[PDB]
Amino acid sequence: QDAQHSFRRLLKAMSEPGVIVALHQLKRGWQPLNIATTSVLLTLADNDTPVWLSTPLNNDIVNQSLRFHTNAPLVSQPEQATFAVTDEAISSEQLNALSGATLILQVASLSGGRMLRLTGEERMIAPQLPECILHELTERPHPFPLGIDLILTCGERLLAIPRTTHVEVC
């Protein structure tokens, strides 16, 4: 798909938190970045938006792909990120460093986790998330607009949970 396609689908996901959309702006992701993360980065990042990749996703091939296709500054630490890309090993420390940034969290499934109710009319989803991310979403310790916007990606699919969404467990 073209870039405009990616932009519209990402808008839709952001507009309707928890709805899953598919983005496929190239045939393969810059592995281990999935196709949705890669497409989000092609869509939003450029020379003005530093990107920080956590250690598991930070390798020379990923860095080279991202530099060539986006020219975003690839920063060594989360405190300077406009876009953070991690997997579910993201630590509480790194999360707190991102308050805020947009966190593209790669997950190995968008289902099969603890049930969440999203409001802000409700939507139910159940992605698998690390406890630090669940805490952030359910407690919202940082006043608007200091916290992260979250984009969860898996394969070519994604859903968004903007910082303004209310999230509950139960």
Binding site for Na ion (CB under 5 A): 14-15, 56, 128
CB of 120 to Na ion, least distance (A): 11
- Comparison of 77 and 109: residue with beta carbon closer to Na ion: 109
First to last CA, the chain: 38
Rounded CA-CA distance 155/162 in Å is 20
CB of 2 to Na ion, least distance (A): 21
State the number of CA atoms in the 13 A half-sphere of 64 facing the CB. 4
CB of 45 to Na ion, least distance (A): 9
In the chain, what are the helix, strand and coil shares in percent, each to the nearest 5?
30, 20, 45
- Comparison of 27 and 121: residue with beta carbon closer to Na ion: 121
- Comparison of 15 and 77: residue with beta carbon closer to Na ion: 15
- Comparison of 27 and 75: residue with beta carbon closer to Na ion: 75
Rounded CA-CA distance 117/43 in Å is 28
Cα–Cα nearest to 147, from 107, 104, 96, 90? 96
CB of 128 to Na ion, least distance (A): 4
Cα–Cα nearest to 110, from 98, 124, 93, 128? 128
